[PDB]
Amino acid sequence: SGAIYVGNYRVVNRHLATHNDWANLVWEDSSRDLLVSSTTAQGCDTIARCDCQTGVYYCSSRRKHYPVSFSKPSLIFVEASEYYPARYQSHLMLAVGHSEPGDCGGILRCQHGVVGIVSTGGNGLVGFADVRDLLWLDEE
Ligand SMILES: NC(=O)[C@H]1CCCN(C(=O)[C@]2(Cc3ccc(F)cc3)CCCCO2)C1
Numbered sequence: 001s002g003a004i005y006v007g008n009y010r011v012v013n014r015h016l017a018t019h020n021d022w023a024n025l026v027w028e029d030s031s032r033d034l035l036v037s038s039t040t041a042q043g044c045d046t047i048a049r050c051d052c053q054t055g056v057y058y059c060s061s062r063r064k065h066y067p068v069s070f071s072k073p074s075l076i077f078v079e080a081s082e083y084y085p086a087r088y089q090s091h092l093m094l095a096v097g098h099s100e101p102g103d104c105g106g107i108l109r110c111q112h113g114v115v116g117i118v119s120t121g122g123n124g125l126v127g128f129a130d131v132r133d134l135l136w137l138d139e140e
């Protein structure tokens with residue numbers, strides 16, 4: 001579990017969104033595994049607006065932050081699961097790192113701010129949904 005809290009927005013994995021998230025919906029995209037809801041209180045996270053391909057992510061199944069190198073956002077095949085049919089997930093970045101399903105929502109960051117959130121895994125792989133192109137998160 002986990003979210004990004006920027007401005008009056010809460011960014012979560014779409015497959016983990018709550019009823020309150022759906023009832024206060026700003027934007028959602030199944031192809032990216034992202035959902036954004038509105039918040040009453042202002043958040044403290046800042047979004048990175050950069051070209052970093054190295055950063056650090058939080059792994060809840062280890063209670064640890066790990067440094068990682070990650071690929072550029074791309075369209076990657078994600079097999080049918082208990083949350084989606086077989087499809088291509090867009091804006092996904094892969095790295096070598098430990099992950100488990102409950103690790104979704106952990107933040108990936110660089111020196112510029114938040115880059116994305118854990119969305120996918122694999123044997124020694126972790127995938128992150130990028131948020132750096134969502135410029136509207138910085139306003140309203
Ligand atoms: N974004 C998606 O489509 C995920 C929905 C849940 C299923 N998805 C997965 O990748 C996994 C679960 C997972 C493990 C570790 C993670 F950090 C994030 C998810 C692992 C690979 C195959 C089986 O399920 C894909």
Ligand SMILES: [Zn+2]
Pocket residue numbers: 048049050051052110111112113
């Ligand atoms: Zn950066």
